[PDB]
Amino acid sequence: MKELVEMAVPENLVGAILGKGGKTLVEYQELTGARIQISKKGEFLPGTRNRRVTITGSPAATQAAQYLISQRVT
């Protein structure tokens, strides 16, 4: 069983998630086995300046990746 988690990441912190070169985003995927994607390098959520991050995989994989990203959201 697989699921999709969608979370918000303020535009001024996204450089944190990527880590530059995508290094971190690749590592988090690597460690968890969850696929992680960040919204259009131009568009955000609602009356938002938060980009949308989509995480897919097993519930446990998805939760470990959301958690690890959350630690870096300042």
Swiss-Prot record:
It is found in: Nucleus. Brain. Expression restricted to astrocytes. Residues 2-69 form the KH domain. Interacts with PTBP2; the interaction is direct. It is linked to Neurodevelopmental disorder with or without autistic features and/or structural brain abnormalities: An early-onset neurodevelopmental disorder characterized by intellectual disability, motor and speech delay, autistic features, hypotonia, feeding difficulties, spasticity or ataxic gait, and structural brain abnormalities including cerebral atrophy, cerebellar atrophy, and/or thin corpus callosum. Functions to regulate alternative splicing in neurons by binding pre-mRNA in a sequence-specific manner to activate exon inclusion or exclusion. It binds specifically to the sequences 5'-YCAY-3' and regulates splicing in only a subset of regulated exons. Binding to an exonic 5'-YCAY-3' cluster changes the protein complexes assembled on pre-mRNA, blocking U1 snRNP binding and exon inclusion, whereas binding to an intronic 5'-YCAY-3' cluster enhances spliceosome assembly and exon inclusion. With NOVA1, they perform unique biological functions in different brain areas and cell types. The third KH domain (KH3) recognizes specifically 5'-YCAY-3'. This is RNA-binding protein Nova-2. It comes from Homo sapiens (Human). The gene is NOVA2. The chain holds residues 406 to 478 of 492 of the full protein.
